[PDB]
Design an enzyme around this catalytic site. Structure first.
Site, short mmCIF file in Angstrom:
data_model
loop_
_atom_site.label_atom_id
_atom_site.label_comp_id
_atom_site.label_asym_id
_atom_site.label_seq_id
_atom_site.Cartn_x
_atom_site.Cartn_y
_atom_site.Cartn_z
N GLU A 157 0.79 -1.40 0.18
CA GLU A 157 -0.10 0.09 0.03
C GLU A 157 0.89 1.36 0.03
O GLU A 157 0.70 2.10 -0.54
CB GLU A 157 -0.86 -0.19 1.28
CG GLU A 157 -1.86 1.37 1.21
CD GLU A 157 -2.67 1.46 0.11
OE1 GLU A 157 -2.95 0.64 -0.57
OE2 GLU A 157 -3.11 2.66 0.05
N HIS B 86 3.11 -10.05 -9.44
CA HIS B 86 4.49 -10.52 -9.58
C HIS B 86 5.25 -9.44 -8.84
O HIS B 86 6.26 -9.92 -7.96
CB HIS B 86 4.96 -10.38 -10.82
CG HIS B 86 6.72 -10.64 -10.99
ND1 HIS B 86 7.20 -11.73 -10.76
CD2 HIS B 86 7.50 -9.53 -11.20
CE1 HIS B 86 8.61 -11.29 -10.71
NE2 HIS B 86 8.72 -10.12 -11.29
N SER B 87 4.98 -8.33 -9.00
CA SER B 87 5.52 -7.30 -8.17
C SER B 87 4.45 -5.64 -8.33
O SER B 87 3.57 -5.80 -9.07
CB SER B 87 6.93 -6.45 -8.94
OG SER B 87 6.48 -5.85 -10.03
N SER C 197 19.20 -8.12 -8.59
CA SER C 197 18.04 -8.50 -9.52
C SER C 197 18.17 -9.45 -10.42
O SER C 197 17.24 -9.98 -10.92
CB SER C 197 17.47 -6.98 -10.30
OG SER C 197 17.60 -5.75 -9.28
C1 LIG Z 1 18.46 -12.32 -16.13
C2 LIG Z 1 17.25 -11.89 -15.85
N1 LIG Z 1 16.34 -11.95 -16.82
C3 LIG Z 1 15.12 -11.28 -16.53
C4 LIG Z 1 14.75 -10.65 -15.33
C5 LIG Z 1 13.44 -10.04 -15.14
N2 LIG Z 1 12.48 -10.60 -14.22
C6 LIG Z 1 12.68 -10.26 -12.88
S1 LIG Z 1 12.00 -11.51 -11.94
C7 LIG Z 1 11.14 -12.51 -13.42
C8 LIG Z 1 10.42 -13.57 -13.17
C9 LIG Z 1 11.29 -14.46 -12.28
O1 LIG Z 1 10.24 -15.75 -12.04
P1 LIG Z 1 10.72 -16.87 -10.91
O2 LIG Z 1 12.05 -17.31 -10.96
O3 LIG Z 1 9.79 -17.94 -11.32
O4 LIG Z 1 10.38 -16.33 -9.50
P2 LIG Z 1 9.06 -15.57 -8.62
O5 LIG Z 1 8.98 -14.09 -9.12
O6 LIG Z 1 7.63 -16.36 -9.48
O7 LIG Z 1 9.25 -15.93 -7.49
C10 LIG Z 1 11.87 -11.84 -14.50
C11 LIG Z 1 11.69 -12.55 -15.91
C12 LIG Z 1 15.81 -10.56 -14.28
N3 LIG Z 1 15.62 -9.96 -13.21
N4 LIG Z 1 17.16 -11.26 -14.54
K LIG Z 2 20.67 -12.73 -8.15
#
Ligand SMILES: Cc1ncc(C[n+]2csc(CCOP(=O)(O)OP(=O)(O)O)c2C)c(N)n1
Ligand SMILES: [K+]
Ligand SMILES: Cc1ncc(C[n+]2csc(CCOP(=O)(O)OP(=O)(O)O)c2C)c(N)n1
Ligand SMILES: [K+]
Ligand SMILES: [K+]
Ligand SMILES: [K+]
Ligand SMILES: [Mn+2]
Ligand SMILES: [Mn+2]
Lengths: 391, 329, 329, 391
Positions: A71, A286-287, A157
């Site tokens: 929030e 997701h975020s 990240s």
């Molecule tokens: C190398 C890389 N590629 C793409 C991203 C963008 N990205 C940030 S989180 C995400 C999904 C990750 O999914 P998962 O590992 O299943 O974790 P969850 O969020 O579902 O817990 C992506 C594609 C990133 N951070 N790093």
């Molecule tokens: K990492």
């Protein structure tokens, strides 16, 4: 008998391709049902009341903090947030099974591990606000936590980069006879990255005491697992690298605990990697940058939630009641709100700090750039938000 | 100008370039992380429904795979438009780009090529992207013969340049300034059109100093030009470089021969940044005309910070102050 | 000078630096492809027997794993000396180097670091290495704050610089010019010693022109200096840069303030090569002293060819001709 | 029943880690024994005489060429070479099972595939010498072959990069309804690279008609497989990605053929990937730069060689004899020597060619560098080996 150096195997005289078994995959290990009842008494870890209450209070305090920070981001007070809804059981069940000084590497959606380790609300807050109290000096995006005192390696990240890193830490631990395990958390999406393949293989060949812990929550942002892989999830990959592997119901804190406890014991004793795939569901977006309605929750929120399942267990045992629930909801809200208010009142760190720690010692040319910003601010400072920043 | 136009911002102009491409080229496919539902910046919305799930699709989460896969599509002659979700995450694919894509045609004596590959990726600062959602990686690719690197400043420019990348017979990296995705709209042709690669654009003529930038930073130097005119009585020539490699050496040199002074600016860190290549080339070509040293106004030599972003970026005040010193040199 | 010395060529001086390191630092480990038997250039011969299989060991064939693994060792505070078999194969690890190693200390506010990591790799042309055994990747790393990049010209220099990299509290890439591995031996201290990082070395004083290079190319510009003296009566100051980043700006500038002319040479391709960063910096700092444009004599903007190597490299004739034009400018 | 989206599985109520089975791994499929006798008649592919003689003559002609080029490198006549000893069966057995226009991607130790496809000796030679006849224009190291006419993608030195590339070609083939398979060769060392994990996964999720063919020859340069992996070789990894997988005796041309033929049929019909791990032994050094005595052969050279095993089969069937062996040895030697002499007599290509094909069109700044070399050679040409190069 075959004499080839690459495998240990008999001959076979019929052509037969090995078929993956996906429809009936590696079974999901479960200790308590959705009503919080123990299914098989011989698997009951019979944790003491005070530790089980710590599991519960850690999960709910994290939930409280998630609600408030989510929030706070929607109000424009922090730039970004990622919630942990539906996955709080994978966090505290596993953390509970570790030694305090076992080293943790994570992805971003494992804040409950830090909660369980008593990381102060003030410092979760300070990192999200990038304020003067942040030991990260405000340099990273929110939820990129790190704590040297509680052995939780700073989150970054880029996905999966921590996996081969955790393997190297585990190797160094083995050489030092640390008698400690490294655990390395990642999502099922991140398991697609080349780094996962490097980490898994190096762990087995170099014989490292490490637990790979995969949260499989059914999505990687918008991408469902049918588009992520075609094998039997992540657990089915472990054996091919020589890694002992198990799949657990990650909404069941006891199943997560039992698997992590046994993996830790064996990994540290045998210097051998273990893989745990915790099956869960990503309840939130997701975020704060994601609107999950663009691509897909209450079945999970209401039928199979780690917090609800442990509450039922606690109510069934007479270890919690409505009066305790009500009082805890109130006090944890107040504790989070107190950290929150204090965090918003603090200034951001001195802008000079954008230049230090690039290297241990600032190179002369970097100091010159630092000096150049100082001179710049002396002339043009009125065009910068200097009053938000320490001086 | 180019048939019927309509108001588009930068994300919409990208969608339109891609729709045009899949309408006219039956081989063309679009793929990457989360592209099927429309993408995390909405650049591929509608395309899967319009063109089919075999043409616009999600891959697994693996950048080295995405680029390797797209090279392989292009080896067969089919147009492959790969997406990398943020330019900060292009590095896992660096070996496939540098050792493979860039060298594919040369090393085969032109028996094989991956000319029909384009890699598009969001790029540049965004207010609070911090270390891994803000990067400007173009200088890392500038040192790699065999690829092209293209960066637009606006919706009209983005659609024209992207279509040129898609159609160009060489592997191209197209970086989209993500802070412009929902910035002001402008008129953009609905139908396809092309803007040439390796051609800079002089967007304002001037006589005292040449300013060069690309992406969002073009808008910063345009505002610096207006400040210099008002505060200093200085006439600035403003050039959008557009293509990082191969770059338009002639246009920049011609401007500096006229003005005698050059300031180059980019969000990427100073050291090894692409401004050094422009500076050292102009200095070799225009040496006798230089009235003052070539200035470079860039990001600091640090990772890209979260809370300190306002202090990090080469803004109009940083660029103005530098310009003021150069004119007084 | 430094206690008892003995004749060593460059591979042997590397072995000696590494033996010294594992003798004095019990945490130190050495790992990579084929290091256990001594390595494909014999740089680790004897060390596994001397120090144990847990300290000198083979990894699986995966460069992204090797660098990720070494960062992880270093996070715990143990010295990690990773080997990448040829610098051409460092690219799979580019994301772990650039996004992880370089940013580890900064992004954690110094809670965590990988300072105790060194990555060593054979580098530069070798006569017939072609596209993937000849590369000089230093400019790709020069644009990445948080790493150091170091390149020696000789056995004595290599051992001193490598020990400084191993001991330095920042992740370091140490590139070994593989064409020097079995070139002439020179006297090298048996015991450890250090040569400072970010310090260039003026190896010959001169007054008319400054020549800068690194690795094998230092020997080329030294020979060009002797040709210029004999054929042109020109006194050349010859500088080995040694550290690519952070580089010794002051030493180069001081030389050019004295001479008024600068020629920089490197085997890596011209465009985006590190010579642009040196040129554009010296031009900013020394502008009023420049008698002629800064010259860059580099590899062509192509991949590194097999049969055409003799025509590709910036040899003494290419460098001499450039110098001749600069003195006549 | 579990409801998690990430896997299809039952619950299980006992904690049990999945253990890799390495000691008794995926069996090795074998059609003929070391005496060239068929072990199980129902597996006999009963190839016609002329095709089996082509297998044999392809293997031996490659062996002849290897011996001559290896020696030519030791004499300083070519800069580099890599032999194919002990692995010639994996090459021709698999190539024999493909359509002429199935697209091949390789690593470097699959020259027999090009031999089988009738690639001229002159052009193997021209590439090793970098002479004017080389369609690669002398740009790459020896043994980096490529042929557009015979659908064999130019080899490159970086390991495993071709794997996700072959998957993309296979996808494009599927869209075009090409009715063709892509096959992608690599070593067991290269299977450690992150690119292998990307290729395998993308092939299964995107449903691509591709055969992954792994030569497992027990070493990656000096590195034995005990240091390469701890799982059951490469075959055991396939099922975890959802890939149909098989392990074959790669010194048995018929076992290799049968597995490749069946994989090709099913992959093209079902748009689904197949993995074949061919168990063999690397008889030679890794390359002319390697002295394998520094880290480790005649058991393999004399007991279990693909050429010896097929010769025995041919002798057992009355399809070859000493007189035919003797005459073929002689004629193939003469054919290789004729190509060899012709290749050494040719000049290298014009030095200008170092500049073309960087891009399709030479950029103006690159043409300027080309012009700069021309002017350079006009003044300093006597210091260059211009008489070795076309003019
Ligand atoms: C190398 C890389 N590629 C793409 C991203 C963008 N990205 C940030 S989180 C995400 C999904 C990750 O999914 P998962 O590992 O299943 O974790 P969850 O969020 O579902 O817990 C992506 C594609 C990133 N951070 N790093
Ligand atoms: K990492
Ligand atoms: C990315 C990369 N790393 C390292 C090398 C150096 N290298 C060339 S071949 C080789 C061994 C490959 O072994 P394997 O895949 O088992 O194939 P084999 O030679 O045994 O047929 C290595 C390490 C390279 N070419 N590419
Ligand atoms: K293109
Ligand atoms: K170091
Ligand atoms: K390759
Ligand atoms: Mn997920
Ligand atoms: Mn091998």
């Amino acid at each position: 008998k075959p004499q080839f150096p690459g495998a240990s195997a008999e001959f076979i005289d019929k052509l037969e391709f090995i078929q993956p078994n996906v429809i009936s995959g590696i079974p999901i290990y479960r200790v308590m049902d959705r009503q919080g009842q123990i299914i098989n008494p011989s698997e009951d870890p019979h944790l003491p009341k005070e530790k089980v209450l710590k599991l519960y209070k850690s999960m709910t305090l994290l939930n409280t903090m998630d609600r408030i920070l989510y929030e706070s981001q929607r109000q424009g007070r922090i730039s970004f947030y990622m919630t942990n809804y539906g996955e709080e059981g994978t966090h505290v069940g596993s953390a509970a099974a570790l030694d305090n000084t076992d080293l943790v590497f994570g992805q971003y959606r494992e804040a409950g591990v830090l909660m369980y380790r008593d990381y102060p609300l003030e410092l979760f807050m300070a990192q999200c606000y990038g304020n003067i109290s942040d030991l990260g000096k405000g340099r990273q995006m929110p939820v990129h936590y790190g704590c040297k005192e509680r052995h939780f390696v700073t989150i970054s990240s880029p996905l999966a980069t921590q996996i081969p890193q955790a393997v190297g830490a585990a190797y160094a631990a083995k050489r030092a006879n640390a008698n400690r395990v490294v655990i390395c958390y990642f999502g099922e999406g991140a398991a697609s990255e080349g780094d996962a393949h490097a980490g898994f293989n190096f762990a087995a060949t170099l014989e490292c005491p490490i637990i790979f812990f995969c949260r499989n929550n059914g999505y990687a942002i918008s991408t469902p697992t049918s588009e992520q892989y075609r094998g039997d999830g992540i657990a089915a990959r472990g054996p091919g690298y020589g890694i002992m592997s198990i799949r657990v119901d990650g909404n069941d804190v006891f199943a997560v605990y039992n698997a992590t406890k046994e993996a830790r014991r064996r990994a540290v004793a045998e210097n051998q990697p273990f893989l745990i795939e915790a099956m869960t569901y990503r309840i939130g977006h997701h975020s704060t940058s994601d609107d999950s309605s663009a691509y897909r929750v209450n079945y999970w929120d209401k039928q199979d939630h780690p917090i609800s399942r442990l509450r039922h267990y606690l109510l069934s045992q007479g270890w919690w009641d409505e009066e305790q629930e009500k009082a805890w909801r109130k006090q944890s809200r107040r504790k989070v709100m107190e950290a929150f208010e204090q965090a918003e009142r603090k200034p951001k760190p001195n802008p000079n700090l954008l230049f230090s720690d690039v290297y241990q010692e600032m190179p002369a040319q970097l100091r010159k750039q630092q000096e150049s910003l100082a001179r710049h601010l002396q002339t043009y400072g009125e065009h910068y938000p200097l009053d938000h920043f320490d001086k | 100008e180019y048939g019927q136009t309509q108001k588009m911002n930068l994300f919409q102009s990208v969608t339109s370039a891609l729709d045009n491409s899949l309408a006219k080229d039956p081989t063309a496919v679009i793929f990457g992380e989360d592209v099927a539902f429309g993408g995390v910046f909405r650049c591929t919305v509608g395309l899967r429904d319009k063109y089919g799930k075999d043409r616009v699709f999600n891959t697994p989460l693996c950048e080295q795979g995405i680029v390797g896969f797209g090279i392989g599509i292009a080896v067969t002659g089919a147009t492959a438009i790969a997406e990398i979700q943020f330019a900060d995450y292009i590095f896992p694919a660096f070996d496939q780009i540098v050792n493979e894509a860039a060298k594919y045609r040369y090393r085969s004596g032109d028996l094989f090529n991956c000319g029909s590959l384009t890699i598009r990726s969001p790029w540049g600062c965004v207010g609070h992207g911090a270390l891994y959602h803000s990067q400007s990686p173009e200088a890392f690719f500038a040192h790699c013969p065999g690829i092209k690197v293209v960066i637009p400043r606006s919706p009209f420019q983005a659609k024209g340049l992207l279509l040129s990348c898609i159609e160009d017979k060489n592997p191209c990296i197209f970086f989209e300034p993500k802070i412009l995705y929902r910035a002001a709209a402008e008129e953009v042709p609905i139908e396809p059109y092309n803007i040439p690669l390796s051609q800079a654009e002089v967007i304002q003529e001037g006589s005292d100093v040449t300013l060069v930038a690309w992406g969002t930073q073009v808008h910063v130097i345009r505002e610096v030009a207006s400040m210099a005119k008002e505060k200093l009585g200085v006439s600035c020539e403003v050039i959008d470089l557009r293509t990082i490699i191969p770059w338009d050496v002639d246009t920049i040199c011609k401007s500096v021969i006229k003005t005698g002074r050059l300031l180059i600016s980019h969000e990427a860190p100073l050291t090894g940044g692409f401004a050094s290549e422009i500076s050292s080339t102009v200095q070799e070509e225009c040496f006798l005309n230089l009235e003052a040293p070539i200035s470079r106004v860039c990001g600091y030599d640090t990772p890209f910070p979260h809370i300190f972003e306002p202090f990090y970026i080469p803004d109009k005040w940083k660029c103005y102050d530098a310009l003021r010193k150069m004119i007084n040199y």
